[PDB]
């Protein structure tokens, strides 16, 4: 189900090539024949508008699109009824006979789950959760628990809903805690780091992603190259260079992951340039990471500017720690940028107290302000010490 949501997401924003939309349309047309995408197929016009979202022959009549395959017709209307009779009408009649004959226990619960998964592809979520809720009481061990969690896990990836999914996934996992192997636990662990990108948790996302394996592929839930970009980009932003040398840049799987596909451009272009402290070619890597990684990915396109703006602030901190002073002529020219471009980035960073530095105008020397023995007891002990005392006085001043 994720293969369609990944390819059709390129239909939303394409600023360069038109063929990217037609190439991604070939994967959509192939999957809609085997499985009915009608809930997401109708969600195409309800997601992003004023591109392809105005083209429909049924609910709303307008023609504006670069893709004519997303509009209903007489063929898809007949196929919608054929898939609805086989996956629901034909299967429910056989399950109804098993209910009266009393055949098995978990077999009827698993049959309701497989039947409930078909309502998700027809576009009716009321009967999908109704048949799933009846089979939830029959779940005891991890045999029927994986299938119940699998249906709710689809709600997050297929319907792109971060609200009612995680609340249900946590309730099912916390009811009976076993986990089976480590891969069945990834469904809760991988979606955890993915949900952190919606509410912008930053370093919290990479907690379970860095320790996760790079060979994990959920197919219909997620692809191989999609999860590879989530752990590479978020893991690089979380762990500092101290932890990058013993984990990211040197790993048995990660070194094998970068050679599989060239669509990462994170653990190779960004990591080596950061480890070698080469700022000449490091700047164009951020543009390739933004265009060819962040934009095509689903959850990596939500932040947008929040990647390059924050990553550029931290890469300067690695340079400020290795020198007391610097050269403004070398930073604003030799690294591939201009003078006005450097003052715009550092202009917003200084008043936010995100770093300690000394910028020179006439002399043109970038000097680092080093606390020496001050460290974390200088401005943090007074701010965090007295700041928490303000929260302590909240309930003590007003009582109840």
């Amino acid at each position: 189900n994720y293969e369609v949501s990944e390819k059709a997401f390129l239909l939303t924003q394409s600023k360069v090539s038109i063929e990217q939309r037609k190439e991604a349309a070939e994967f959509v047309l192939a999957k809609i024949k085997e499985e009915e995408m009608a809930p997401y197929y109708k969600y195409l016009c309800e997601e992003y508008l004023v591109n392809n979202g105005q083209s429909d022959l049924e609910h709303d009549e307008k023609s504006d699109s670069l893709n004519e395959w997303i509009k209903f017709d007489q063929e898809l209307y007949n196929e919608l009824c054929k898939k609805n009779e086989s996956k629901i009408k034909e299967l429910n009649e056989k399950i109804q006979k098993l209910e009266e004959d009393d055949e098995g226990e978990l077999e009827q619960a698993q049959a309701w789950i497989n039947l409930g998964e078909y309502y998700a592809q027809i576009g009716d979520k009321d009967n999908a959760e109704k048949t799933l809720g009846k089979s939830l009481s029959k779940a005891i061990s991890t045999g029927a628990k994986i299938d119940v969690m699998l249906t709710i896990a689809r709600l997050g990836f297929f319907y792109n809903d971060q609200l009612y999914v995680k609340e249900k996934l946590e309730a099912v996992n916390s009811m009976i805690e076993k986990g089976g192997d480590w891969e069945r636990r990834n469904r809760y662990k991988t979606y955890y780091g993915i949900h952190c990108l919606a509410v912008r948790n930053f370093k919290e996302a990479a907690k379970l992603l860095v320790d996760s394996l790079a060979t994990f592929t959920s197919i219909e839930l997620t692809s191989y190259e999609s999860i590879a970009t989530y752990a590479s980009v978020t893991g690089l932003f979380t762990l500092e260079r101290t932890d990058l040398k013993s984990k990211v840049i040197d790993s048995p799987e990660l070194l094998s992951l970068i050679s599989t596909t060239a669509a990462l451009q994170s653990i190779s272009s960004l990591t080596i340039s950061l480890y070698a402290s080469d700022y000449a070619s490091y700047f164009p890597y951020l543009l390739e990471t933004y265009a060819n990684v962040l934009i095509p990915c689903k959850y990596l396109n939500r932040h947008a500017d929040f990647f390059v703006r924050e990553m550029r602030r931290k890469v300067y901190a690695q340079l400020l720690e290795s020198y007391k002073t610097l050269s403004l002529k070398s930073m604003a020219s030799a690294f591939g940028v201009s003078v006005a471009f450097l003052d715009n980035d550092l202009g917003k960073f200084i008043p936010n107290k995100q770093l300690n530095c000394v910028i020179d105008r006439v002399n043109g020397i970038v000097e680092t302000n080093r606390p020496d023995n001050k460290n974390a007891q200088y401005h943090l002990l007074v701010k965090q010490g007295d700041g928490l005392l303000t929260k302590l006085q909240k309930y003590g001043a007003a009582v109840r």
């Binding site: 543009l287 947008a304 591939g336 201009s338 471009f341 980035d345």
Partner: peptide, 19 residues
């Protein structure tokens, strides 16, 4: 935004490579 950072990076590359 991305339009500001990408524009200033490409315009400087044309001038820097000509020096």
């Amino acid at each position: 935004d991305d339009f500001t950072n990408e524009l200033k990076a490409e315009l400087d590359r044309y001038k820097r490579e000509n020096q």
